[PDB]
């Protein structure tokens, strides 16, 4: 079931019950296109089975936001290949991640590449994907260079910036996920299908 709570006086958060689902996130992606295509919505930030819609005219739209986002929710109407250079300097924890999972370096790079991941949402840093559902066999305990692929329990992703991280790094990427001067600054959008391509 859905709940609609006011987050301050400028946003409304639509959430869903804790057992998350890919079908519920698909509608959240579909609603995030609809919400940003009108003048009254400054931003539409999706999360985990939830979407935060900030408003430009909250004085009128505030109470309406609890009656309107619930109804729009009842209606609920790309493929990118990232080149990852696994092991060596890019992935120093590749040897340690292969030890815990009980599979060699080639086996841990073969199933990590086989899974075609989808972007649930972007947050924390500019252009950082929360890639959902990593194989249950590849799960393992926890400044990192930019474009570094790493693992952290059930979560897997890429580091677009140079910041201190706790994930075990299994590889590195040359393709910039966040580039402030390209044309399309952020590569990944919510709902895109990420694939990781090995190189050595």
């Amino acid at each position: 079931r859905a709940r609609c709570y006011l987050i301050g006086e400028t946003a409304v958060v639509l959430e869903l019950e804790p057992p998350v689902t890919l079908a519920s996130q698909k509608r959240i992606w579909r609603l995030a296109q609809r919400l940003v295509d009108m003048p009254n919505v400054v931003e539409a930030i999706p999360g985990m089975n939830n979407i935060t819609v900030i408003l430009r005219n909250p004085e009128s739209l505030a109470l309406d936001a609890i009656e309107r986002l619930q109804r729009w929710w009842e209606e609920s109407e790309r493929f990118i290949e990232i080149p990852v250079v696994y092991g060596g300097a890019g992935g120093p924890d590749l040897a340690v991640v292969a030890a815990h999972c009980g599979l060699s370096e080639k086996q841990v790079v073969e199933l990590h590449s086989s899974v075609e991941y989808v972007v649930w949402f972007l947050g924390f840093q500019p252009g950082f994907p929360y890639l959902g559902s990593l194989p249950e066999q590849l799960h393992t305990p926890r400044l990192v260079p930019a474009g570094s692929v790493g693992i952290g329990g059930p979560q897997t992703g890429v580091y677009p910036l140079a910041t201190p991280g706790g994930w075990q790094l299994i590889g590195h990427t040359s393709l910039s996920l966040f580039d402030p001067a390209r044309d399309e600054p952020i590569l990944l959008r919510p709902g895109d299908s990420v694939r990781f391509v090995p190189q050595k």
Binding site: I45, E59, F124, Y130, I186
Partner: protein, 300 residues
């Protein structure tokens, strides 16, 4: 056209904000004291969100090469222009070859400096706000240092009243307000909160009483905005500011209203902070009154 001698400790080029990209993990940034920068740009004739220098604890000297007008807002640092003492909230004139010397202020924290025409720097994604974590905007995405020059744009003396600052800040409860026991909900309003040294442009860490949460249920990563007060496992509340994370998985006890966000910026690192329980009509009327206040400044 604006040469810097002593830059200080945390000086940056700040704007209205890098909006439209919160969905892709980019913080909007901009001035912490948005009303201070807006009044300064208004006094000089620029657009209210034009690029102006943010200064933390004064200690700034800037030599002027081009003739025009300037203004100072925010915390009063007793600015001295060559052989005269200039004050905050005035469209002051400037000639070529004059230094403006700000000192460490006794009251307040952040001070703003705007010039006629605006600081012409490359607008990275419809904004010139410096993002120190990402390394973009302003002048190469970093703090201003000694010897740098910032190029002024092409412009094409009424004193205005500034806004008073205080330690009482109106916050609205929830979404996770009903997860804290009665001794923690009361302490949040009744008990004072001391500012910690960890507090920076991203988020303010508050030292006080240990707020106990009743539930131990995991929170799914949700979209955040400046002013949201998060309480981690340690029980010490963290106030999110402009450079904060767009997503987080911590329980949110309260949210500070946009009309009172400017007060946080001036609070010194050793002074307390009191929270006042607010209402939605009060939060919205207070937001209008401040938006309505800049329209009064626009008629001078």
């Amino acid at each position: 056209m604006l040469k810097i001698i002593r830059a200080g400790m945390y000086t940056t080029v700040q704007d209205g904000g890098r909006h439209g990209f919160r969905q892709s993990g980019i913080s909007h940034c901009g001035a912490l004291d948005m009303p201070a920068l807006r009044i300064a740009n208004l006094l000089v004739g620029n657009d209210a969100n034009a690029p102006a220098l943010e200064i933390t604890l004064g200690q700034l000297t800037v030599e002027f090469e081009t003739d025009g007008w300037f203004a100072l807002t925010g915390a009063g640092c007793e600015a001295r222009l060559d052989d005269n003492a200039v004050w905050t909230g005035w469209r002051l004139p400037m000639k070529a070859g004059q230094r403006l010397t700000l000192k460490r202020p006794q009251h307040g924290m952040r001070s703003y400096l705007a010039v006629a025409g605006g600081i012409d720097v490359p607008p990275v994604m419809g904004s010139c706000s410096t993002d120190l974590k990402v390394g973009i905007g302003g002048l190469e995405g970093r703090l201003l240092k000694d010897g740098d020059r910032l190029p002024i744009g092409k412009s094409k003396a009424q004193g205005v009243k500034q806004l008073l600052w205080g330690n009482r800040i109106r916050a609205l409860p929830g979404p996770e307000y009903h997860e804290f026991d009665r001794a923690s909900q009361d302490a949040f309003w009744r008990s004072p909160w001391q500012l910690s040294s960890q507090s920076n442009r991203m988020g303010y860490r508050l030292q006080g009483q240990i707020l106990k949460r009743t539930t131990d249920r995991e929170l799914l990563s949700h979209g955040l905005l400046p002013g949201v007060v998060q309480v981690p496992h340690n029980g010490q509340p963290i106030v999110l500011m402009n450079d904060a994370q767009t997503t987080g998985g911590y329980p949110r006890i309260a949210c500070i209203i946009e009309a009172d966000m400017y007060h946080l910026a001036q609070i010194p690192l050793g002074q307390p902070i009191h929270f006042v329980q607010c209402s939605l009509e009060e939060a919205l009327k207070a937001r209008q009154d401040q938006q309505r206040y800049f329209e009064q400044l626009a008629w001078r």
